[model samples]
Target: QDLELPKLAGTWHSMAMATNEISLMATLKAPLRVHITSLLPTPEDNLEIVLHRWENNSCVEKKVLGEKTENPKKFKINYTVANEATLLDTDYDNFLFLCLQDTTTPIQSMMCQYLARVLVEDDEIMQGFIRAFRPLPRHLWYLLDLKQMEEPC
Candidate 1:
């Protein structure tokens, strides 16, 4: 997909998260629990991700810079202890699917996110998210719906 960085930049809602570890998804302090607030694409092709997280019953904002890689859809972010964030699919206007992985880890930390421009749920977009991860085994997935935790900082 020809992902336009400019169109991809802006406010986005973290609709859902999926990971290989079920316990991580169940845990409140999991790395996948964070909500992305905005994205900014740099002139050098890198991407900056600003996200808000709940910590100690309060909101904490973080700025993560993702260095661009050889692949336009892929980026290397130092977050999650060296993560490779890749854009799997994006409609630019409605939804975007991202997959982040920590290859250095023994278990291979994999976190996939479904982001949308709107906070409301859409069956069509949900189905798209499902299709995007079709290559992975369904049993390995632990999905989390972010609606309950969504809030402005």
Candidate 2:
């Protein structure tokens, strides 16, 4: 019921990700394979999120606004479709995992992401994320390779 929005505001790097719609992010050329770069809290309880992705051998930045919902841990983002972003877990200073779902669709699409404060490799963090999702299907998870080209601007 409670989420520390301030603690979540700052730079972040995508370490790994999983999704029910696996094919959309299964390869480097997939359209949904984007890396998160930063999150900023707004006065209206919204969040300004920045994501970066590689397109045509170049980097592209996409800014998205997540509107606060009934629960602090949940927010909504409007793309061509609407997605509910849920803050699944976070240690504040280290790693956090999030789930974004499109509830409006007939076949609900869900994506889970593990993000870190820094872009360095940490076995502990990776293991923690792995254990957290161990109960779920293993084939859904993928370690992000897009981190190499992540740039906030």
Candidate 3:
């Protein structure tokens, strides 16, 4: 009885930025098309999350998607998943990983989770994002579900 993870396919929008110290955001208007294969632990006991972007008919080069910290005092990188969506005729889960890569010495790492259950049709997401900037007692990571809408269309 092992738990199975859902297969992640299709394009997803992402916003990458540093922690409270530095702020840099990267946005993709269209699907940043990606594919995730296998969710098993590697020989080193770290989660082996494989990902790649598609270009033309072939998938791009493979890159390891994980959090690593060289030092904990001077630098850090935070990778968070956000804005999950699915395209027409495609039944897939998609989310953006807000990556905060720092260059200071002794780099640390953090992860903030954001989930989008449906498509973002308006700028409401941005409003919520602004509030997230404030420091709170909660963990640095954040989770948001787009499908949990409170208002009517």
Candidate 4:
């Protein structure tokens, strides 16, 4: 799809995902372990994030939203993602999604992810969140197949 990045991710910005819709926790029906090791931050600019993913079935597949670095005017941030490529939309509000399918011993189905910038309540901000897999056939997001996660570190 010609879906350009209308948006992006980070932790600061007083962001606390407002809606309790879906999350990475959904794709998991297995014994899984995830840990986000917070490294030092570069003042108000960067957030050193290191997350660990572990399962009895596959080798540890770790993820780092890399440096959730901030900007001067836009206040938007960047994230380092693996597995399924990431699509971000900041229109209206912020929306984040991850899409992939399992083929090896780890999984055999589509591992689609849907995330929102938690809607604001009253006069508040995107205060909370929910994320899960909404797997459609690979054909739905067929273009994504062209983009692949680099060799896992």
Top model number, TM-score: 1
Off by over 4 Å in 4: 1-6, 11-83, 86-92, 103-108, 119-153
RMSD of each: 2.2, 3.2, 11.5, 12.6
Superposed model 1: Cα runs more than 4 Å off: 137-139, 148-153
Which ten residues in a row are the worst by lDDT in model 3? 82-91
Encode model 4's per-residue lDDT on 1-153: one tens digit a residue: 333222233421211211111233333322112323222234544334344444554546344432331322112223221222223222324444333323333433333333334423322212211212212222222111111122121
- Write down the TM-score of every candidate: 0.87, 0.79, 0.29, 0.30
> What Cα-based lDDT does every candidate model obtain?
0.78, 0.74, 0.31, 0.29
How much RMSD separates candidate 4 from the native structure?
Answer: 12.6
TM-score result, candidate 1: 0.87
Q: Alpha carbon lDDT of residue 68, candidate 1?
A: 90
What value does the lDDT take at residue 4 in candidate 4?
29
Winner by TM-score between candidate 2 and candidate 1? 1
Number of clashing residue pairs in every model? Answer: 0, 0, 6, 12
